[PDB]
Design a protein around this ligand. Structure first.
Ligand SMILES: [Zn+2]
Lengths: 48, 50, 330, 417, 83, 98
DNA sequence: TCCGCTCACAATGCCACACGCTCGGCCGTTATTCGCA
RNA sequence: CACAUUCCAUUAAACCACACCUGGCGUGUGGC
């Protein structure tokens, strides 16, 4: 949940961030691109 | 607008967009102010205290 | 600082209700009270800022008089021949310059004085604009109905007031409805709302006919009297100076069509058009009609009229509070 | 109980009814809550309530049915209609509804709708599958609106001159360009009187924006049709509210194949109110006018058209000019090449006690061949060519003297030969 | 109110039933405006409204709803602690 | 330095320290051991979750105190349930009988 | 084949630094649409 | 028909904070 990883609006270019929020957003986008590899015009390097 | 500024300074409703981001002295600590320093970025005109 | 004083005087909200010389005098008074608050003594000073473009150049009033109390504003007549004063009152000289008209307390008192002055200006403007409609009827929503009086919206910042004594237990009010009347008194020298409109005055109905009855207004008829016990009985007495019209038959309309209209406009009050005569005897006889009167006497030294009625029409002779008589005595 | 009998009745009968019902002191409050409490009492002792009005859908989802006499304003007299009706009957803003309503319990204070009966004077089955307003195909006016009554009164000659200068038809756009002091109020009043006396089948609507209240009350009971007006007494929010109300009512009525006729006065004041009510978009010209601030007024003037499928909409909006400010001037410039029938009323003829002050030289109407016959058009063109070399006041008095003797424009034309 | 917690492996259907949505976009929050994403990292229909008893678009602020999902984006109006 | 009741952190719903300019005091391990060496199960439960963990528990306790109700609510810590749900985020059902 | 014995940690543990509250371009492809029924 | 999500006389609902770094605090890396 987001409350264990709060992104509070901060004064200036500084912005309080965290780490896991990028790790599984990375897994989200990786699943998206592997879906790109899942369904259309896709050779065995895909399944690998 | 500047006309809106001078109107709000005399008439009109409360200040719409302020958030009261003014800094206040922390709780408990007291004292007497003795000096004020101001630093301004180039281009910005200095206020009367500066 | 002069640029800011300009920006202010030219960037006012109500350029019409607040003329330019009014802004000048308001700024002068604000800076005057600021300079008063400056010094620990009490000395009256005007700033006389250049009305068009320039900045201020204050003065110092001294009030030529043989007194000594508050010598800051005291100059004796004998010790005043210097500087070519030679006068008894008006020694407003330039002994004081260097006014500060932009600091915190000065800005606050100037804002306060400006608020007071624009309030006074809008009051004066509304009163001397809507006072022209003093004889005619005024239409407008009610701002708010209080206990002592009710205040009414008439237009753009337009306020009127109707007193409580002129109200009725059956005449009733709440913010939102439009109640009309006649502007009976205007006190532009008062402290607040000064547009006093009443409804219980008799001539009111006269002007009602003036906006309804076509016979009145052209001098062909002459609405002479009006007896108005508000909510009880509102009779009218007219006279025709021409020889081709009738006093009552033309004004009633067509079997109570316009008279009942003005009645339900007044609040459904019973309105009966009486015909007064050149003598008070027939006048009071008709005022207590339809009924019989066995004796009509007039007394000048007592300033009274003895009206002794007969038995047979009491239901119309007295009524409630002797209204059929109460109008005549009124 | 029906609503209109208690709406358009004088407040005195309402006071009598409320006093006879044995209620609280009724005359001490607004007419709105007076009639609200009267309806509540009659529902507590009586049958279902019967209400009616025009529907407005907010951004919230529900709808409010408001009456015509209050200029469609909020209050206790409104009728709350749930979004379930807007999903079932597929309601829209400006739908003229009339039907059964119930009293409110705790949590509510407005009379909730029970069952609709008449939607825009039509059956819900017929109104279900219909045609949208903007989906219609505009066209030019074909049926000319006869403004001459035929009696030839002292003032109807004005209307006659109008027929002489601007043939009005179902679907035309009329712009009355007249400075103040010029006498357009009684002109519009006579126009409404004539168009209701000659064409009583088509609905007639007038709109007084930023107008004096006395004129509102004297017009709301002198001419036919609901006289909706938003006087200057209220802010511009109510003005844009009533503008949307009347425009959606007209759109729904013309979608139901009804000839709608709108009389709007004045359009410059309405556009100024629009300019101050809609948020600014940054770009500002001289006179304190915004770019998008004229978009909604423009739309309002463009809604009028001649529908090919059924019915039409004819708007007649007057533009107040010659006031000193720049708002009215830029508005009249933006609306100059907008309406297809201008009518200029110069104050030079009005101040000379010569009414109607009509600038016949600068007035005209496009595509008048589709409104008048052949010889009528030929006579009109001959009269125009004859009057054009003349000035304004002289031509006006000549026309007045030539029209006072005759009673009909046809005899006038044949006698002018 | 309980006793003897248990630790073992997992199950997919329980994760699905305990999850109140499916995140699909890597963006956490908009950079221009501070509004959370529709189905990104900082979501609303998966966790809850960012403010107490306030809808995401604001049209369902009323407490009478207390669970009515929005029609534009979709939020169950409740307290922030639910998130 | 003393604190009755003030703001809490954003990452955690616990009182802050000296940098908050109003925070309280830190409860480490040694005094936890010293307290459990004594009795005071109720006192330790209060010091642990009613004053630091249960965001609703502290509010309810303040409400009970301001009307004279000097009684405590059990109020199992919410952060306990959060760590249980995290363990499930790797995985196990967290079953509660009684 | 069986038994015993150091290296990277793991780590009470702090510390330091970077800042905040392997590198580059590009290649590719995509999924990209904020419709309210 | 029908669900029904209402423009909200005293007043409970509109409350609140984000900085200087070897000791105002933590994340990443490295160390045994
Ligand atoms: Zn929403």
């Amino acid at each position: 949940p987001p409350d264990l990883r709060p992104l509070v609006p901060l004064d200036g270019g500084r912005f309080a961030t965290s780490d896991l929020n990028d790790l599984y957003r990375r897994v989200i986008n990786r699943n998206n691109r592997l879906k790109r590899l899942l369904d259309l015009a896709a050779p065995d390097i895909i399944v690998r | 607008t500047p006309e809106e500024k001078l109107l709000r300074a005399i008439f009109g409703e409360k200040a719409s967009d302020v958030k009261d981001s003014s800094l206040r002295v922390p709780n408990g600590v007291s004292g007497t102010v003795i000096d004020v320093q101001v630093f301004t970025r180039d281009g910005v005109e200095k206020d009367k205290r500066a | 600082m002069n640029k800011e004083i300009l920006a202010v005087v030219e960037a006012v909200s109500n350029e019409k209700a607040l003329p330019r010389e009014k802004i000048f005098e308001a700024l002068e008074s604000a800076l005057a009270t600021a300079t008063k608050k400056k010094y620990e003594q009490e000395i009256d000073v005007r700033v006389q800022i250049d009305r068009k473009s320039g900045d201020f150049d204050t003065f110092r009033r001294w009030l030529v008089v043989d007194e000594v109390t508050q010598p800051t504003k005291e100059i004796t007549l004998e010790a005043a021949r210097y500087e070519d004063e030679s006068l008894n009152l008006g020694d407003y000289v330039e002994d004081q310059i260097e006014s500060v008209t932009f600091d915190r307390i000065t800005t606050q008192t100037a804002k306060q004085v400006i608020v007071q002055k624009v309030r006074e200006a809008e009051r004066a403007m509304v009163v001397d604009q809507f006072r022209e409609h003093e004889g005619e009827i005024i239409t407008g929503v009610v701002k708010k109905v209080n206990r002592d009086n009710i205040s009414l919206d008439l237009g753009n910042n337009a306020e009127a007031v109707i007193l409580r004594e002129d109200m009725l237990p059956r005449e009733n009010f709440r913010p939102g409805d439009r109640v009309r009347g006649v502007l009976y008194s205007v006190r532009p020298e008062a402290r607040g709302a000064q547009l006093f409109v009443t409804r219980s005055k008799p001539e009111m109905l006269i002007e009602l006919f003036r906006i309804e009855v076509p016979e009145i207004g052209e001098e062909v008829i002459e609405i002479k009297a009006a007896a108005r016990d508000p909510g009880s009985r509102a009779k009218i007495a007219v006279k025709t100076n021409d020889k081709r019209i009738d006093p009552v038959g033309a004004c009633v309309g067509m079997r109570g069509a316009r008279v009942q209209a003005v009645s339900t406009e007044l609040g459904g009050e019973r309105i009966d058009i009486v015909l007064w005569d050149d003598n008070p005897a027939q006048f009071v006889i008709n005022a207590m009609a339809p009924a019989d009167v066995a004796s009509i006497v007039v007394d000048e030294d007592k300033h009274t009229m003895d009206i002794a009625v007969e038995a047979g029409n009491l239901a119309q002779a007295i009524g409630r509070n002797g209204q059929n008589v109460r109008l005549a005595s009124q | 109980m029906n609503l209109t009998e208690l709406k358009n009745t004088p407040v005195s009968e309402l006071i009598t009814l409320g006093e006879n019902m044995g209620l609280e002191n009724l005359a001490r409050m607004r007419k709105q809550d007076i009639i609200f409490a009267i309806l509540k009492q009659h529902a507590k002792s009586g049958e279902d309530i019967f209400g009616d009005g025009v529907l407005e859908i907010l951004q919230d989802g529900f709808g409010f049915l408001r009456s015509a006499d209050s200029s469609y304003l909020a209050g206790p007299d409104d009728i709350y209609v749930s979004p379930s009706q807007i999903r079932r009957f597929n309601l829209r803003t400006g739908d003229t509804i009339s039907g059964k309503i119930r009293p409110p319990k705790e949590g509510e204070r407005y009379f909730a709708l029970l069952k609709v009966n008449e939607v825009n004077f039509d059956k819900p089955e017929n109104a279900r599958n219909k045609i949208l307003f903007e989906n219609l195909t505009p066209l030019h006016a074909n049926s000319r609106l006869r403004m001459e009554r035929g009696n030839g009164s002292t003032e109807d000659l004005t209307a006659r001159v109008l027929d002489l200068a601007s043939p009005i038809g179902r679907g035309q756009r009329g712009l009355i360009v007249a400075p103040p002091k010029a006498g357009k109020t009684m002109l519009l009043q006579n126009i409404a009187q004539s168009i209701a006396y000659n064409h009583p089948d088509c609905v007639l609507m007038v709109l007084l924006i930023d107008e004096r209240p006395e004129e509102v009350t004297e017009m709301q009971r002198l001419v036919k049709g609901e006289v909706v007006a938003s006087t200057f007494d209220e802010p511009a929010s109510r003005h844009v509210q009533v503008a949307e109300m009347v425009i959606e009512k007209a759109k729904r009525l013309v979608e139901h194949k009804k000839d709608v006729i709108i009389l709007l006065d004045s359009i410059t004041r309405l556009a100024r109110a629009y300019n101050t009510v809609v948020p600014a978009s940054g770009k500002v010209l001289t006179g304190g006018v915004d770019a998008n601030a004229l978009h909604r007024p423009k739309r309002f003037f463009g809604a009028a058209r001649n529908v090919e499928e059924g019915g039409s909409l004819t708007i007649i909006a007057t533009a107040l000019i010659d006031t000193g400010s720049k708002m009215d001037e830029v508005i009249y410039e933006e609306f100059k090449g907008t309406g297809n029938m201008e009518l200029h009323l110069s104050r030079k003829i009005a101040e000379k006690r010569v009414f109607p002050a009509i600038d016949y030289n600068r007035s005209g109407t496009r595509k008048e061949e589709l409104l008048t016959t052949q010889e009528e058009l030929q006579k009109m063109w001959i009269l125009r060519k004859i009057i054009h070399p003349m000035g304004e006041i002289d031509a006006m008095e000549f026309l007045i003297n030539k029209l006072a003797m005759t009673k009909t424009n046809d005899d006038f034309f044949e006698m002018m030969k | 109110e309980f006793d003897a917690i248990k630790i073992a492996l997992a199950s997919p259907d329980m994760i699905r039933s305990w999850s109140f949505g499916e995140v699909k976009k890597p963006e956490t929050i908009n950079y221009r405006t501070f509004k959370p994403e529709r189905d990104g990292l900082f979501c609303a229909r998966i966790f809850g409204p960012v403010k107490d008893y306030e809808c995401l678009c604001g049209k369902y602020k009323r407490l009478k709803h207390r669970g009515v999902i929005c029609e534009k984006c979709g939020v169950e109006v409740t307290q922030t602690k639910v998130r | 330095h003393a604190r009755s009741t003030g703001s809490y952190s954003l990452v955690t719903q616990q009182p802050l320290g000296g940098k908050a300019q109003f925070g309280g005091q830190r409860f480490g391990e040694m005094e936890v051991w010293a307290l459990e060496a004594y009795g005071a199960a109720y006192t330790l439960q209060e010091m642990l979750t009613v004053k630091s963990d249960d965001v609703n528990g502290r509010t309810k306790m303040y409400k009970n105190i301001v009307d004279g109700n000097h009684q405590m609510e059990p109020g199992m810590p919410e952060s306990f349930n959060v760590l249980l749900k995290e363990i499930r985020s790797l995985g196990i059902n967290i079953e509660l009988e009684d």
